[PDB]
Design a protein around this ligand. Structure first.
Ligand SMILES: *[C@@H]1O[C@H](CO)[C@@H](O[C@@H]2O[C@H](CO)[C@@H](O[C@@H]3O[C@H](CO)[C@@H](O)[C@H](O[C@H]4O[C@H](CO)[C@@H](O)[C@H](O)[C@@H]4O)[C@@H]3O)[C@H](O)[C@H]2NC(C)=O)[C@H](O)[C@H]1NC(C)=O
Ligand SMILES: *[C@@H]1O[C@H](CO)[C@@H](O[C@@H]2O[C@H](CO)[C@@H](O[C@@H]3O[C@H](CO)[C@@H](O)[C@H](O)[C@@H]3O)[C@H](O)[C@H]2NC(C)=O)[C@H](O)[C@H]1NC(C)=O
Ligand SMILES: *[C@@H]1O[C@H](CO)[C@@H](O[C@@H]2O[C@H](CO)[C@@H](O[C@@H]3O[C@H](CO)[C@@H](O)[C@H](O)[C@@H]3O)[C@H](O)[C@H]2NC(C)=O)[C@H](O)[C@H]1NC(C)=O
Ligand SMILES: *[C@@H]1O[C@H](CO)[C@@H](O[C@@H]2O[C@H](CO)[C@@H](O[C@@H]3O[C@H](CO)[C@@H](O)[C@H](O)[C@@H]3O)[C@H](O)[C@H]2NC(C)=O)[C@H](O)[C@H]1NC(C)=O
Ligand SMILES: *[C@@H]1O[C@H](CO)[C@@H](O[C@@H]2O[C@H](CO)[C@@H](O)[C@H](O)[C@H]2NC(C)=O)[C@H](O)[C@H]1NC(C)=O
Ligand SMILES: *[C@@H]1O[C@H](CO)[C@@H](O[C@@H]2O[C@H](CO)[C@@H](O)[C@H](O)[C@H]2NC(C)=O)[C@H](O)[C@H]1NC(C)=O
Ligand SMILES: *[C@@H]1O[C@H](CO)[C@@H](O[C@@H]2O[C@H](CO)[C@@H](O)[C@H](O)[C@H]2NC(C)=O)[C@H](O)[C@H]1NC(C)=O
Ligand SMILES: *[C@@H]1O[C@H](CO)[C@@H](O[C@@H]2O[C@H](CO)[C@@H](O)[C@H](O)[C@H]2NC(C)=O)[C@H](O)[C@H]1NC(C)=O
Ligand SMILES: *[C@@H]1O[C@H](CO)[C@@H](O[C@@H]2O[C@H](CO)[C@@H](O)[C@H](O)[C@H]2NC(C)=O)[C@H](O)[C@H]1NC(C)=O
Ligand SMILES: *[C@@H]1O[C@H](CO)[C@@H](O[C@@H]2O[C@H](CO)[C@@H](O)[C@H](O)[C@H]2NC(C)=O)[C@H](O)[C@H]1NC(C)=O
Ligand SMILES: *[C@@H]1O[C@H](CO)[C@@H](O[C@@H]2O[C@H](CO)[C@@H](O)[C@H](O)[C@H]2NC(C)=O)[C@H](O)[C@H]1NC(C)=O
Ligand SMILES: *[C@@H]1O[C@H](CO)[C@@H](O[C@@H]2O[C@H](CO)[C@@H](O)[C@H](O)[C@H]2NC(C)=O)[C@H](O)[C@H]1NC(C)=O
Ligand SMILES: *[C@@H]1O[C@H](CO)[C@@H](O[C@@H]2O[C@H](CO)[C@@H](O)[C@H](O)[C@H]2NC(C)=O)[C@H](O)[C@H]1NC(C)=O
Ligand SMILES: *[C@@H]1O[C@H](CO)[C@@H](O)[C@H](O)[C@H]1NC(C)=O
Ligand SMILES: *[C@@H]1O[C@H](CO)[C@@H](O)[C@H](O)[C@H]1NC(C)=O
Ligand SMILES: *[C@@H]1O[C@H](CO)[C@@H](O)[C@H](O)[C@H]1NC(C)=O
Lengths: 103, 132, 440, 125, 125, 125, 53, 42
């Protein structure tokens, strides 16, 4: 199965909200996971099963489905969040990833 | 679960490399029914990240009976095993190419029925570099 | 104007957790069937018309409960058995002697020292050990489990054969059986009938293939969780059995030696006659027919254009990469590579080499390890291959060929096939309804 | 018929075969099988007793079907009698009124206690 | 007298001392004695519950002697009433009708169910 | 209110809210906790069943409040009715009757049985 | 020692008494014990003097 | 000065994995956990 993730990159201020989405080519229920990686650091889990929150992270992160369109919303951006984001489903991984950075 | 990986490795093309991922005090799980410790059903995945590229899933090992499953692209050259006595997992990559250099991560999966392919704990990462 | 009335014994049920008890039909067996309540000669079986109920083989708790059960009986049968710690001694082993080229180096003639019935003396005792049970430190070897876990010998009077056991819910609970012959894993089952309790369930112990067990009715069926999920396994259920004959063509005499006061240990005596290799046979034509039926029923979830290839396991422990099972109180690990070689595209028998192990650690327990005692005489068993535990292999989007391989290990997947058509439910005999009456 | 025979049937048939499916609500060392069987038997007895005590509170003990003194508030359900008793199965009705069960049970309990008190006071004459 | 005192007596004598012997129907670690005692206690409770439920289904719960509405088919026993009530003992009478016992239970259950349905229908108006 | 809510209250308040505590009379390996809990549950069921036995033998099954047909012998308590029902809580009443329970219990059952017999002899006509 | 070549001899605890203390066997509720009061009662057969307990 | 003899470095000859050869093995014990008979302690 193929996963298409958008946008390739985006930029935002401090405290604003952003959204990052990806579409999977099939029906996968809610089996989508969200990963963030700071530069030079090992990626850690934030959203599992596309609507649950991993322990030990802020509650400003959210994720949801609309049909087969999975999205992640960020509110009140704190600029430690600069890094990369990926969505995984099953064995496939989203190519490239989406990099978020301050203005 | 705290995950300790191996060190940075440099290997010439055509050789073989091995990366060790240790997850202490986490292979065994209590079974309150029988009241004894059984080897868990957890999974250990192996991912790689090329310089400036998204992660790629190599394969994973269910450590119960050591069952494995590899990505078909790497099939025939990657072996994945586990040692329950020392609570570690070994990746053995054979006949590396110039593009094989990357940061290799070992990841832990609780293998819960509801959430599929959830990798919670991640190793510090290893630098596998191939050059002539 | 309306009023409320209560009704007792109203046909309402809700899915719920519940402890179930065994019940068999009337020798100490590793499954304590002698403690099972005897079953009635004619189990009650009631059809249910116009009844549609959801089913979920994967969320079923019956499989988990019965797995916990089987574990409990297995441990309990080992508690009153002879401890085998004094075996962890240095073994002076030599190679064994009228042996074919296949079994070269797979049998070791090991002599060593044992504590006798008394203690001031020790005895020199020789025995035969399979190569998979010993590891080098004539040469000095030691048992495979000496630096990890302890060894307890199964008492050589417990029949390891799977005697069918019916799981039965207590009063106030019911079992619903899905009579729909075309029923996949989950979903509604229009043809559902209640029963007092389950049919004959054989707790057959196997990893790669399903032995004996229960067949389908109409045609071979492929049941699984998300077939998109490479991780999730693929249960297969055949419409006709594949008769497999597995045997160990060695005489394999047994020698009972004494290692402690009262406690005795049974070792492998010198084999009388030629030492061949234990093997299994399956009919080539029948196997080809079964595989063709499987691929035809399997193309439905992937498309006719897709190619399907069966390959031997990709690796793991001896008990998963090979076909591991139990026959006549002995353990077999069969190579089974010759059983997966097809490349399906839109009288002869298939011999399978097998190896024998005695240090068994099924359901890996930190600290325990069964030592299977040797069995006198040549041993042979005919079984029905009924299902396969297949696993997919994740492939590229451009690639159009899917590769299936045998899997297993997780015995819950093995056991779900025998309980896929059963659901435990709780009867709620209390209801309220509006009528026009008014109590005086 | 038999146990749960009228499960798919409408109200009319089910409301006449209560006894056949109420008859089977109730039918040695410390081995795993033994302890499982003992716990199962005790659980069945406990469930039966809970149901019987609930029946006894509403003053309908010993009766398969009994009439009561509180009316059917349309808030619980607005469906008319005819289609209720000739159109839907028991399971559907239970799923329709499941989330309203506690308050109606309390209503029956209070009404039965009040009726008993009033009957005692009247009998005091 | 006391428990089982008049067992060998006549129907006439025994049929008036039901209570004295019906009253006595209900009257640690995991050792052998403990598990045996627990099993015995739960078995006695289960047996009594079975009997009480069998009383309840025929609408006689809480009644020592209840009257029914099912005719006595003479095929079971054609003996005269006075004969069986003035000469026999209860054991002999039970032995005589042992094989005719499930049928009468079924007839009683159906009769009580029909009577209850008729009572509800009458109480509707 | 709640469980045992009117425990200290007077006769009248308690005699109006019995069912709040009547409904709360009824609510795995072989480890210490398992056997302890199993014994607790079996004992609770047995106690409730003995209570049900005593209630059923008095012909008041399923009734929180039932009346009898035996005189209140003044030898037990010859006190004015109004002061009993307006002064003393149930606890003190029990502490003043506890010596005299068994006899009255027996009287009850006997009367009940006799009554039943008489009723049967009336209904045979 | 005699049984060491076939058995697993275990020592009885010192303070536990072997003396047979009289015990009573009681049936649970809903059961009775019928005792033959007759003093001439041979092996089997009817006992005309039965007492419950 | 508060650990004068409190901790004892005790070595013994516990058997190795296989029950035939002895291996010298050291450990630390608290003085309240040993009794005298370097010296010999049990
Ligand atoms: C699927 O089901 C079939 C049908 O039951 C089953 O085949 C059976 O396998 C067992 C396994 O050995 C066979 O049992 C043997 O039968 C021979 C002939 O009667 C006996 O001589 C053997 O006796 C040995 O075992 C005894 C156990 O107490 C010892 O006391 C004795 O000394 C011998 O050592 C042994 O009982 C059996 O004959 C067949 N057939 C039938 C009809 O049972 C097959 O094994 C099943 N598939 C599995 C389990 O994978
Ligand atoms: C119990 O003893 C056994 C046997 O001694 C131990 O298994 C052995 O563990 C060693 C650990 O170094 C393995 O050596 C390794 O071999 C691989 C090749 O497979 C090699 O590439 C490595 O560099 C390393 O040398 C050895 O293979 C292995 N043998 C077997 C049969 O398992 C086991 O670890 C011990 N368990 C303990 C100490 O808890
Ligand atoms: C494994 O090796 C042992 C060690 O020999 C074999 O056990 C038996 O050992 C005894 C004494 O060592 C042998 O006795 C001698 O046999 C020779 C030839 O038969 C005879 O000339 C002597 O007088 C003496 O009796 C005995 O032979 C040997 N057993 C056999 C069957 O030869 C054991 O057999 C070996 N295991 C095998 C070969 O599978
Ligand atoms: C454990 O030790 C006892 C004591 O020696 C063994 O019992 C003895 O067994 C031997 C051989 O089985 C018997 O010898 C025979 O004696 C008869 C006379 O009764 C003689 O005619 C025969 O030629 C033969 O020598 C011996 O009688 C017997 N003793 C008793 C008291 O029964 C027992 O077999 C041993 N158990 C083992 C080794 O498992
Ligand atoms: C794939 O697997 C997921 C595992 O959760 C299935 O998703 C569940 O489906 C059931 C329907 O039986 C729903 O009740 C759950 O809410 C779903 N949960 C989640 C997390 O998705 C899904 O149905 C399977 N099939 C497909 C095509 O996705
Ligand atoms: C098993 O059969 C049931 C019954 O049709 C399937 O349930 C429906 O299947 C269709 C076609 O796949 C879907 O469009 C529906 O959405 C399913 N129902 C629900 C409630 O989701 C079920 O999918 C079948 N299982 C498999 C693995 O094919
Ligand atoms: C396997 O070994 C046993 C034991 O020797 C053989 O059984 C003996 O066979 C011979 C003749 O072949 C008889 O004289 C003996 O009476 C048999 N019993 C014993 C105890 O010796 C058996 O024939 C061998 N082969 C098999 C079972 O195929
Ligand atoms: C499995 O099949 C093989 C080959 O068809 C059998 O091996 C032959 O067995 C016969 C009889 O035992 C011997 O005479 C032959 O020498 C064996 N080899 C060959 C090449 O024919 C084997 O016996 C079969 N085993 C079972 C259990 O069916
Ligand atoms: C496995 O064993 C069975 C039973 O011994 C064999 O079935 C026999 O096969 C021969 C030749 O095909 C027939 O003549 C017999 O009538 C069969 N007997 C029975 C009882 O079925 C079978 O051939 C063996 N091999 C395989 C691969 O099944
Ligand atoms: C599955 O079949 C393949 C067939 O190639 C086996 O691969 C060979 O196994 C032998 C066994 O020693 C090795 O010597 C070869 O080097 C292997 N070939 C390759 C390309 O790796 C494989 O072992 C089989 N798997 C099993 C039996 O579990
Ligand atoms: C399982 O069986 C296969 C095939 O019988 C074995 O693969 C053979 O391995 C040898 C030695 O490496 C090669 O010479 C053969 O060419 C291989 N055959 C095939 C078809 O590839 C394999 O080694 C066996 N594995 C085990 C563990 O027994
Ligand atoms: C293997 O499969 C065959 C299929 O025929 C089984 O034989 C049937 O068994 C069922 C139940 O025991 C009977 O109702 C049928 O009458 C049998 N048919 C025939 C033709 O025998 C057999 O029991 C299975 N198990 C084995 C052989 O161990
Ligand atoms: C405890 O005792 C007091 C006084 O003895 C009770 O108070 C009575 O409350 C009722 C309810 O309004 C009044 O009608 C009475 O007049 C009060 N008593 C007096 C003497 O005035 C009280 O109800 C008792 N119970 C509790 C739970 O407090
Ligand atoms: C089954 O038989 C057909 C007949 O030609 C053959 O093409 C196919 O390869 C066979 N499959 C096997 C032997 O797995
Ligand atoms: C099933 O529904 C049909 C609807 O026409 C009805 O006639 C039939 O009686 C129902 N089945 C049962 C067993 O009542
Ligand atoms: C026993 O038989 C005698 C004989 O008349 C009778 O008087 C008596 O009532 C019977 N029953 C008892 C309990 O004695």
């Amino acid at each position: 199965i193929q996963v298409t993730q958008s946008p390739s990159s985006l930029s935002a201020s401090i405290g604003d909200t952003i959204t990052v989405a990806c579409e999977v080519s099939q029906d996968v229920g809610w089996a989508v996971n969200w990963y963030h990686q700071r530069p030079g650091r090992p990626p850690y889990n934030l959203i599992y099963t596309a609507h649950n929150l991993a322990p030990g992270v802020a509650s400003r992160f959210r994720g949801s489905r609309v049909g087969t369109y999975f999205t992640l919303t960020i509110n009140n951006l704190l600029p430690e969040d600069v890094g990369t984001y990926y969505c995984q489903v099953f064995d496939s991984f989203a190519p490239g990833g989406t990099r978020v950075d301050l203005r | 679960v705290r995950l300790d990986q191996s060190g940075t490795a440099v290997k010439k093309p055509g050789a073989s490399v091995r990366v060790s991922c240790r997850a202490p005090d986490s292979f065994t799980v209590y079974r309150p029914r029988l009241s004894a410790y059984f080897i868990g059903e957890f999974n250990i995945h192996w991912l790689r990240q090329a310089p400036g590229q998204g992660l790629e899933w190599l394969g994973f090992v269910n450590i119960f009976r050591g069952a494995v499953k590899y990505s078909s692209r790497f099939q025939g050259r990657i072996t994945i095993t586990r040692d329950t006595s020392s609570e570690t997992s070994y990746l053995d990559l054979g006949a590396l190419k110039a593009d094989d250099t990357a940061t290799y991560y070992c990841a832990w999966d609780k293998n819960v029925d509801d959430n599929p392919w959830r990798l919670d704990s991640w190793g510090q990462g290893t630098l596998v570099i191939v050059s002539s | 104007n309306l009023w409320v009335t209560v009704y007792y014994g109203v046909p309402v049920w809700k899915d719920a957790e519940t402890t179930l008890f065994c019940a068999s039909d009337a020798k100490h067996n590793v499954w304590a069937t002698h403690a099972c309540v005897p079953t009635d000669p004619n189990p009650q079986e009631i059809h249910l018309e116009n009844v549609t109920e959801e089913f979920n083989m994967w969320k079923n708790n019956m499989v988990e409960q019965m797995h916990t059960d089987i574990i409990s009986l297995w441990d309990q049968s080992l508690k009153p058995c002879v401890k085998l710690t004094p075996l962890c001694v240095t073994l002076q082993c030599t190679n064994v002697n009228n042996i074919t080229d296949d079994m070269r180096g797979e049998l070791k003639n090991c002599s060593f020292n044992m504590t006798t019935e008394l203690r001031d003396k020790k005895q020199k005792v020789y025995s035969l050990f399979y190569r998979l049970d010993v590891v080098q430190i004539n040469k000095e070897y030691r048992l495979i489990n000496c630096n990890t876990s302890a060894i307890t010998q199964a008492c050589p009077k417990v029949s390891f054969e799977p005697i069918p056991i019916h799981y039965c819910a207590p009063a106030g609970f019911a079992i619903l059986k899905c009579k729909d012959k075309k029923f996949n894993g989950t979903g509604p089952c229009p043809s559902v009938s209640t029963v007092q309790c389950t049919h004959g369930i054989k707790p057959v112990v196997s990893t790669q293939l399903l032995l004996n067990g229960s067949l389908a009715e109409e045609e071979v069926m492929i049941r699984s969780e998300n077939i998109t999920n490479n991780a999730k396994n693929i249960l297969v259920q055949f419409n006709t059995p594949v008769q497999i004959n597995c045997t160990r063509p060695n005489n394999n005499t047994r020698k009972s030696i004494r290692i402690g006061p009262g406690q005795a240990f049974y070792a492998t005596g010198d084999i009388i006659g030629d030492i061949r290799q234990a093997h299994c046979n399956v009919s080539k034509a029948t196997w080809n027919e079964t595989l063709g039926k499987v691929v035809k029923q399997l193309r439905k979830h992937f498309g006719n254009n897709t190619i399907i290839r069966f390959a031997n396991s990709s690796g793991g422990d001896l008990e998963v990469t090979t076909h591991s099972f139990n026959c006549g109180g002995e353990f077999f690990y069969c190579n089974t590579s010759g059983l997966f070689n097809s490349t399906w595209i839109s009288n002869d028998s298939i011999t399978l080499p097998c190896r024998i192990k005695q240090i068994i650690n099924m359901w890996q327990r930190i600290g325990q390890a069964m030592y299977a005692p040797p069995i006198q005489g040549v041993i042979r068993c005919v079984s029905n291959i009924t299902g396969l535990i297949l696993t997919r292999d994740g492939g590229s989007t451009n690639s159009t060929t899917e590769t299936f391989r045998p899997g297993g290990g997780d015995m819950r997947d093995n056991w779900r096939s025998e309980l896929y058509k059963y659901k435990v439910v709780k009867i709620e005999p209390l209801g309220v309804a509006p009528t026009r009456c008014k109590r005086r | 018929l038999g146990f749960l025979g009228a499960a798919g049937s409408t109200m009319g048939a089910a409301s006449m075969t209560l006894t056949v499916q109420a008859r089977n609500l109730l039918s040695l060392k410390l081995t795993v099988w033994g302890i499982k069987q003992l716990q199962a038997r005790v659980l069945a007895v406990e469930r039966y007793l809970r149901d019987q005590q609930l029946l006894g509170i509403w003053g309908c003990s010993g009766k398969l079907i009994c009439c009561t003194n509180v009316p059917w508030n349309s808030s619980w359900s607005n469906r008319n009698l005819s289609e209720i008793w000739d159109n839907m199965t028991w399971l559907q009705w239970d799923k329709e009124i499941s989330n309203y069960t506690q308050i109606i049970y309390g209503l029956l309990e209070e009404s039965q206690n009040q009726q008993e008190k009033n009957e005692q006071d009247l009998l005091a004459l």
